[PDB]
Write an enzyme that holds these catalytic residues in place. Structure first.
Site, mmCIF file in Angstrom:
data_model
loop_
_atom_site.group_PDB
_atom_site.id
_atom_site.type_symbol
_atom_site.label_atom_id
_atom_site.label_comp_id
_atom_site.label_asym_id
_atom_site.label_seq_id
_atom_site.Cartn_x
_atom_site.Cartn_y
_atom_site.Cartn_z
ATOM 1 N N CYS B 96 0.835 -1.186 0.000
ATOM 2 C CA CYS B 96 0.000 0.000 0.000
ATOM 3 C C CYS B 96 0.882 1.253 0.000
ATOM 4 C CB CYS B 96 -0.929 -0.041 1.210
ATOM 5 S SG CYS B 96 -2.087 1.314 1.265
ATOM 6 N N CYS B 99 -0.429 4.099 1.937
ATOM 7 C CA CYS B 99 -0.382 3.871 3.384
ATOM 8 C C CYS B 99 0.958 4.320 3.967
ATOM 9 C CB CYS B 99 -0.599 2.394 3.728
ATOM 10 S SG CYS B 99 -2.214 1.735 3.259
ATOM 11 N N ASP B 100 2.052 3.697 3.523
ATOM 12 C CA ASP B 100 3.375 4.051 4.104
ATOM 13 C C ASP B 100 4.391 4.584 3.107
ATOM 14 O OD1 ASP B 100 3.553 1.559 3.021
ATOM 15 O OD2 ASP B 100 4.422 0.554 4.733
#
Ligand SMILES: [Cl-]
Ligand SMILES: [Cl-]
Ligand SMILES: [Cl-]
Ligand SMILES: [Cl-]
Ligand SMILES: [Cl-]
Ligand SMILES: [Cl-]
Lengths: 275, 277, 278, 276
Positions: B96, B99-100
């Site tokens: 993801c 996400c990060d």
């Protein structure tokens, strides 16, 4: 007029192909036989797929396109009686979903014993006063769930089934059909019943004669690549795709035709992106 | 308990297969891991034995047998359970970018994949990372043209590099995190090593088929089907075992296409059952 | 025993992002997913029941029981095709959740569609080209779909075969051995019930939140776990202090990986503050 | 004519960039003005949001738009010392990633105790001879993983940490800064250390002064509707949305800003669909 994508047919495959093509903003044009997305009512009698763009010849207009999705389905086979040709579109039909609405509260007949005949009889029961299914064999060759529905209406509804019988002659006059001469194939005894219209549902061939010599075909069905690597609806000519019953002689369900129709639109989208 | 037909799954393919099977009065049983009639069983199959007749399915406590099996377990995006992730989660390995990805500002990162997800993640990471290296096993990308053009623009005038015909063999790193990747050119079989601060796996929805490993022919997790124009298009390498929907389709992935193969699977199974005894 | 300071339920962008942040705060999070220093532990189990009325919170798995001081619910949302009410008796014979699957069996028949999102509108539009009439039934006063699709729907409602019944819910699907033949509906604003004849009904709610186990303990609206939201912090907190929700379980509007990642991060930071003040 | 756009996004941090991606995916042809996506490098010094279309005044050009996404972020907060203003861009800075490269093999200081201070000290360690982190509290208000990185370098590297201390005065001459006067807040004992440059990393205030009088604000942050019913990024003016740190004084993470940036683009898309 020229278009990026033209779809031939309006059954589940053609319709599903148009939806997906429209969602990809390809502005598809559906050319369907007379009886966003643009709908043109015309009948293509000839095609030239050897050059770019592809050419389609209609009754009066000619069309050109970068990609073509063939989803013409199938077309009814006729018994070949003279009285059959003679009463066409005047009491004789091969498409209950086309002309069936003109027989509201009238007595009609359906000739055949396959899925098409059963489905047409069931469809006509909700419209007609009575529906008489006539078939040459002793049993029907359709899905069990549909046979049970048919038999329920035959026992408690407006459907009559005449087994082991063939249509000998379609009788009528200037205003149209009004009777049928039938014969029991096992006893050779003939009868005569009154009918306002008859629906021939005895067999279906793919509607592909106009592509003869240009597209690879087998028993009238347009060959497609199929497979698991994409371009599953592509014919031997790049940019020409086929979906639905024209390229399927096994499953023949509305849902399977819808599936390949979707596939055809996505295959066509990829061909257009790389042009 | 024994059944003529068991369907595994709860998506458009499984549902459509059950409808058609029911219309053919086969009394299908749908086994779903969610928790002219159709029976629905809520259980999770953790193992199968397809080498003998009848086929055996092992649930949480109960075992099932069947004459035909329709596999329609679908495909779902995985964010957890990727290889080398458990050791390097949120410290070099991720699935993801949104996400990060922000933890790799001014760092070299890689993206593995060639679909829309991979292209979109590479494009998203370009605005953050020093450089983004897209790694894909094929020679071309299977994504929308508008996204490919965006990617190629950044590859020509930005911080994006593309390595074709290559797969990720191993993620190398230590306690502090990932620092390198072992890759292999699938056409030449030559292996290399590039330095990377983090890798992003972008393959999309993966098929739910680990329990069939070793018994059914598979390619990249997808159950192979005969396909074709002569019928039995949903049949696997084992007669009587059919697959429909996203488990056997890595191209179209639409509800309507899954419904189509689900229907096909039911009709293929019906024919197999008719010719048994 | 099997006690942890923080347990995260889910495996989507929200759950994953919550774990990353929790791990960065050295909370040693545990992610319990139903699939199959500064570290994260992943447990493969399915929680079938929870008790959030006492401290610590109790989670019941297939065989193991867990306890925790804070809970982050990020179970997501998934389309259901099976398990709708009255479906088991009428499956593929009047009740369905896939118009593109069995819609073709209702040619020249009266059908209904239940829902008000994109899925419902698209299914009603798809069924209009097949059915004699399509009756869209929705519990709200407005539709939660793209404007282009609403305009298509309204065009067919004004000049085609589509009818729309607002502020109404499906109470019961009536039928027999051969199939569905009627529906019992109720106007949620007047509580007046009606009965219309239908050959088949199509349930079109879309991806629904996975939250049935929290019924009765957490405040919910249409299956979505209510969160405080706002600009004063604790934006992911439910009605129970220490229980937070992130991602699609608490968002029925945006539903993007990046928005779920955002609330997942928020949930981890909210949980960190709750743990600091214990 | 050409100066008009359906959507204009102010800012290029995670919120602005995520808003542009989503806007572009909806074929809105967004324009990002930062001080199928178009990027304009300009600074808006005045706006008129009382009429349609909205008017934005840049250094030389004027722009008009149907929707506006404000994602201007935040800008470094300063202690307010006279010697701070006096040595700006000459030994005093608030951006280590901007001016840090000019202190290769030199002694520098960082003032603060949050994520910004820790991240700047860590960034400067790879460049400077030594980095001295100065903070008024006994502990740091930053992520534990970053604190551990910092403490590792403080024990075995070129980082020194002076706790319970404030910057009283920045000392220097014509060539720049050369020393700092600091005071232990608990003992009131003052010291003086030599430094070539100091980096102020104590906090971030929102960049929103031009919206005063038109948009509802609280402590400089643009108020947004928030909530669970959509239009969560909308300000008191329909068609004007705010995302990222300009409207968030709690979380302040790149991922949370990206989330609201996405939300802003979707909110703007809905506003444009219903305009006609
Ligand atoms: Cl692993
Ligand atoms: Cl591939
Ligand atoms: Cl493989
Ligand atoms: Cl889960
Ligand atoms: Cl367990
Ligand atoms: Cl400076």
């Amino acid at each position: 007029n020229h278009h990026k994508l033209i779809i031939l047919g309006s059954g589940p495959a053609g319709y599903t192909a148009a939806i997906y093509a429209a969602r990809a903003n390809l502005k598809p044009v559906i050319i369907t036989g007379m009886q966003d997305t643009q709908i043109v009512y015309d009948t293509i009698n000839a095609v030239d797929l050897q050059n770019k763009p592809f050419k389609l010849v209609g009754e009066v207009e000619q069309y050109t396109c970068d990609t073509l999705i063939i989803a013409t389905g199938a077309t009814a086979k006729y018994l070949g009686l003279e009285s059959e040709e003679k009463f066409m579109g005047k009491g004789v039909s091969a498409c209950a979903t086309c002309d069936g609405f003109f027989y509201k509260n009238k007595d009609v007949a359906v000739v055949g014993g396959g899925n098409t005949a059963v489905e047409e009889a069931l469809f006509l029961s909700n419209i007609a006063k009575s529906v008489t299914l006539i078939h040459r064999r002793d049993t029907l060759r359709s899905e069990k769930i549909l046979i049970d529905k048919l038999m329920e209406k035959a026992q408690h509804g407006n459907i009559n089934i005449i087994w082991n019988t063939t249509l000998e002659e379609v009788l009528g006059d200037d205003m149209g059909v009004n009777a049928l001469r039938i014969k029991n194939i096992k006893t050779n005894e003939e009868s005569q019943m009154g009918v306002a219209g008859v629906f021939i549902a005895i067999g279906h061939t793919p509607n592909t004669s106009i592509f003869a010599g240009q597209l690879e075909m087998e028993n009238g069905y347009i060959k497609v690549k199929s497979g698991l690597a994409g371009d599953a609806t592509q014919t031997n000519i790049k940019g020409v795709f086929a979906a639905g019953d024209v390229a399927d002689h096994v499953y023949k369900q509305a849902v399977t035709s819808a599936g390949t129709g979707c596939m055809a639109a996505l295959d066509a989208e990829k061909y257009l992106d790389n042009l």
